[PDB]
Amino acid sequence: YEHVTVIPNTVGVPYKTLVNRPGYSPMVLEMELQSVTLEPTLSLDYITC
Amino acid sequence: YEHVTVIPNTVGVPYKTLVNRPGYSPMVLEMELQSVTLEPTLSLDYITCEYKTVIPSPYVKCCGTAECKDKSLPDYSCKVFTGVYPFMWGGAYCFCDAENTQLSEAHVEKSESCKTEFASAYRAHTASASAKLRVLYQGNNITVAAYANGDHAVTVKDAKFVVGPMSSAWTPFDNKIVVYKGDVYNMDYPPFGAGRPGQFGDIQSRTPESKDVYANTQLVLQRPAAGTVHVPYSQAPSGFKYWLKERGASLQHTAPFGCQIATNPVRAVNCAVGNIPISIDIPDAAFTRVVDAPSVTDMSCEVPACTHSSDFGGVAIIKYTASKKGKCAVHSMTNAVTIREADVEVEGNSQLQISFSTALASAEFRVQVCSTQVHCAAACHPPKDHIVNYPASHTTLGVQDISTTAMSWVQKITGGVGLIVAVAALILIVVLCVSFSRH
Numbered sequence A: 001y002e003h004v005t006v007i008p009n010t011v012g013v014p015y016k017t018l019v020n021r022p023g024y025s026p027m028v029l030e031m032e033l034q035s036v037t038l039e040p041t042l043s044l045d046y047i048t049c
Numbered sequence B: 001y002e003h004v005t006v007i008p009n010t011v012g013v014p015y016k017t018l019v020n021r022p023g024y025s026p027m028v029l030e031m032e033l034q035s036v037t038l039e040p041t042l043s044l045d046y047i048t049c050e051y052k053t054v055i056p057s058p059y060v061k062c063c064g065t066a067e068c069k070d071k072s073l074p075d076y077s078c079k080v081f082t083g084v085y086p087f088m089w090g091g092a093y094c095f096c097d098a099e100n101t102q103l104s105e106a107h108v109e110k111s112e113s114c115k116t117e118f119a120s121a122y123r124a125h126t127a128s129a130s131a132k133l134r135v136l137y138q139g140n141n142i143t144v145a146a147y148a149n150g151d152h153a154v155t156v157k158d159a160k161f162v163v164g165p166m167s168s169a170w171t172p173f174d175n176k177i178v179v180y181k182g183d184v185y186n187m188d189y190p191p192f193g194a195g196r197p198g199q200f201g202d203i204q205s206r207t208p209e210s211k212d213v214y215a216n217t218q219l220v221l222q223r224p225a226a227g228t229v230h231v232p233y234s235q236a237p238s239g240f241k242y243w244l245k246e247r248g249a250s251l252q253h254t255a256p257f258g259c260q261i262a263t264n265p266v267r268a269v270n271c272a273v274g275n276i277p278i279s280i281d282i283p284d285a286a287f288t289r290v291v292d293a294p295s296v297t298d299m300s301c302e303v304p305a306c307t308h309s310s311d312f313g314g315v316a317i318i319k320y321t322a323s324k325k326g327k328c329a330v331h332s333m334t335n336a337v338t339i340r341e342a343d344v345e346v347e348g349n350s351q352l353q354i355s356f357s358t359a360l361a362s363a364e365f366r367v368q369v370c371s372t373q374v375h376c377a378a379a380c381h382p383p384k385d386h387i388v389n390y391p392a393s394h395t396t397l398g399v400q401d402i403s404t405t406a407m408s409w410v411q412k413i414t415g416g417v418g419l420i421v422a423v424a425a426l427i428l429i430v431v432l433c434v435s436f437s438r439h
């Protein structure tokens, strides 16, 4: 019951995914991105003022 | 009619049987065997238990020489030791210095525990089989029971029937069996009066209250220490008392085909071996005339979803047109497909949905609904799960097993060479017939 799919990294575009498990009515799920955050690991060297 | 059928000895799989009386609507009877018990004939050989070493006070013969008296006790042991000078709290028990002797005597008996704590050695030879069968007869579940030898007719609700004899005579019990409280062991116990010391059967009696007993315990009395009043003797390590350690595994776990062993009485339950014949006679009152049953037309079958699995993974919707309201029997003419439902209520121009089990990936099968066959073409998919906790019910499949594209593929692969062989034969013929007009 694990469905693996690949969606483009674009916010605000609804994507349709069809899960068809045999003997069950097909189901379409719409997926929507809202934010993709890239948090880098920071290391403070020094400050200036 | 008198209907004879053979069903496999497997618990939890319901089998449907089609009774076809000419001029009468077919009748489907659903039978499922609940339990099959194999109670073997028991012959009590003997009982064994813990012994008790009865050791009386030693006969100290002071200033004299003691004499052993010959008694007929089992494992009777007596030994006279010379030159004993035993000491008590206030010195020597004997006035004489050296001519005093110690007579040591000992004998073995059954312990009291023999009435409660005991092992029995039985001789099992033949088993009487009996079965309890549930039959879906006329919309009702009826439960019957009879011994499956083929010579016990049971008539319930006007249905006369007899069961067995079993096709296979296999039994999990051997000739020699040993029974202890709730555990049964297949063991070649030593015969009665020939036990070995330190082994199973060192002390044997015939019944829990008998008075004579056989014993082979190797009791050997040793010489007592100087000035010590005690009775040293060689220990008799009871084979029964440590029998409870090297037992291994009882037959409950080791018997093949999943036989369950119970005691009081000892019996083998649900031994999945072979098939069983059952003959059921029933007069015409259960039967319904072909004219009295509704007829049908314009039958079509569609399988919108099918998966070949242990459960009812196939569902088929049959659109039809009938003539009147009534009960109709459904039966598969193909052994590879099994329908859960046996009887349906037909009305008119309606449609029916049935659940079926199959092991074949494709299923081209004809179903005789209301004494009329309809062909259904299906394709079934493998299931996601590998382990089921209940056994399958669609197991009847072999090597001539129809499938999907496969047989078209083996057709397309069989583009043989016989055309090229024929044109080479033509060349050979036209060479021979230049001068082969005679032979």
Ligand SMILES: *[C@@H]1O[C@H](CO)[C@@H](O)[C@H](O)[C@H]1NC(C)=O
Pocket: B115, B116, B181
């Ligand atoms: C219980 O003990 C009685 C007497 O000691 C004996 O006759 C009987 O077989 C025993 N039953 C069980 C189930 O142990």
Ligand SMILES: *[C@@H]1O[C@H](CO)[C@@H](O)[C@H](O)[C@H]1NC(C)=O
Pocket: B139, B140, B141
């Ligand atoms: C008969 O018993 C079986 C199992 O208990 C059940 O599935 C079936 O519906 C019953 N049928 C009737 C008519 O009682």
